């Protein structure tokens, strides 16, 4: 449970580390596309985090 919790946090940390911010140049519609795609993925990681953590917090 304590080692599970640590492993879940190291995992959540990995997920956040796997979605780094893209180059903010604002050059093309493709630059703002990447930002939109980054945000969706961030929100998803935020939601996956809360749900995983709530199983450890009760």
């Amino acid at each position, epitope marked *: 449970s304590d080692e599970d919790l640590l492993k879940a946090v190291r*995992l959540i940390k*990995f997920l956040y580390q*796997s979605n780094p911010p893209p180059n903010p140049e604002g050059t093309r519609q493709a630059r703002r596309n990447r930002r939109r795609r980054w945000r969706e993925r961030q929100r998803q990681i935020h939601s996956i985090s809360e*749900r995983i953590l709530s*199983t*450890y917090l009760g």
Partner: antibody
Amino acid sequence: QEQLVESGGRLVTPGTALTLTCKVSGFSLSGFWLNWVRQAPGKGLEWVGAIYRGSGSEWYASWAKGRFTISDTSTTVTLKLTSPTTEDTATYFCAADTTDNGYFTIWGPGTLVTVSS
Amino acid sequence: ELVMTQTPSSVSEPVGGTVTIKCQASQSISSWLSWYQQKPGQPPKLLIYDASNLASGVPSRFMGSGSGTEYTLTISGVQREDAATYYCLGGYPAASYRTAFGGGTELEII
């Protein structure tokens, strides 16, 4: 595109350490949950465990811990049966979660393990 | 830790009838619930994801719903090809309670 192929299924005597391999191909994704599911003949599906592919994050069912080891490779995910018994006779499938949302979208055809003397 | 109680164990229904399959979660899983169809000699196939969403390539007669701890798989106009065994999958691999399959439902068509 996305493909999973399991191999290593053999006839073994009890206590014979065995490794099954899930050949992972055509996945655009880097990190994803690669799950191991088993089915004894005429029985239901049972979750064994999973590994989150980018990391070394292994998760096991309460009954699976100590008896199974999931390991990640460059192009593969392995499942080692440390000390099999007759109760471990089953078809073992690998199943990938492509979204991180918990559900299994891609499955392998399975590999059969028979534990008998 | 997580236990998914699936009922009934077996159902016999004539072509055109409605099939109701239930899964009860031992812990709060929210939308972490999916339904699978398995036919002999084949791996299982995804039907419903996130409790109520229809998966790609699945007939519209397959419906998923969830209220708290109770989850339902409805097959409205049962066809001969729907004869199979059905399973729910609850939870998440990194959740404190892990992830678990229900005991399955064997559907036979009259």
